[PDB]
């Protein structure tokens, strides 16, 4: 019927939006998940619109 | 005014003594002694 799957109820693992490594941390400001202080520093210095570009790979962009 | 649903009242005076029972307690196990159980 072309209607054929449903979301999981298992809780979701957290991965770094930049590097895909496991992420302990969720940035409050930019909503990116990040692995460590090195990537938090880089995340806060992204060019305009690059934060949304990282959310797009997760399918989580603002629209 | 309505009496407390859980409290039975005893009162005594020159005429003697009475006990009065809430109608919320008649039909309970507490009513049985007064002849008014479940």
């Amino acid at each position: 019927t072309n209607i054929e799957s449903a979301p999981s109820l298992a809780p979701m693992k957290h991965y770094c939006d930049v590097t895909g490594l496991p992420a302990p941390y969720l940035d409050p400001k930019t909503r990116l998940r990040y692995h460590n202080k090195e990537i938090f520093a880089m995340i806060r210095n992204l060019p305009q619109g690059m934060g949304e570009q990282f959310l797009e790979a997760r399918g989580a962009h603002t629209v | 005014k309505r009496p407390d649903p859980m409290m039975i009242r005893w009162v005594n005076n020159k005429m003697g003594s009475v006990v009065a029972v809430p109608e919320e307690l008649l039909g309970t196990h507490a009513g049985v002694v007064f002849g008014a159980g479940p």
Binding site: A10, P11, K13, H14 | -
Partner: protein, 66 residues
């Protein structure tokens, strides 16, 4: 008839970002294990066990004194 909570399985580790909980990996071995144990006691252990409530049975012992 003994049982122990080892923890919560770490497949649930991201239910929340913080919870006061001890997440442990799922056991990687067989879920059931059968072991031969030769157990030694002494007649004094039986005396002690029969004379008074012992261990977690006797919680009020924590007060000391009498």
């Amino acid at each position: 008839g003994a049982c122990k909570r080892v923890g919560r399985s770490d497949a649930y580790a991201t239910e929340f970002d913080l919870e006061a909980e001890e997440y442990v990996p799922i056991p990687k071995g067989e879920v059931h294990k059968k072991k031969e144990i030769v157990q030694d006691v002494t007649l004094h252990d039986l005396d002690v066990a029969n004379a008074r409530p012992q261990g977690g049975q006797d919680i009020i012992s924590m007060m000391g004194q009498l």
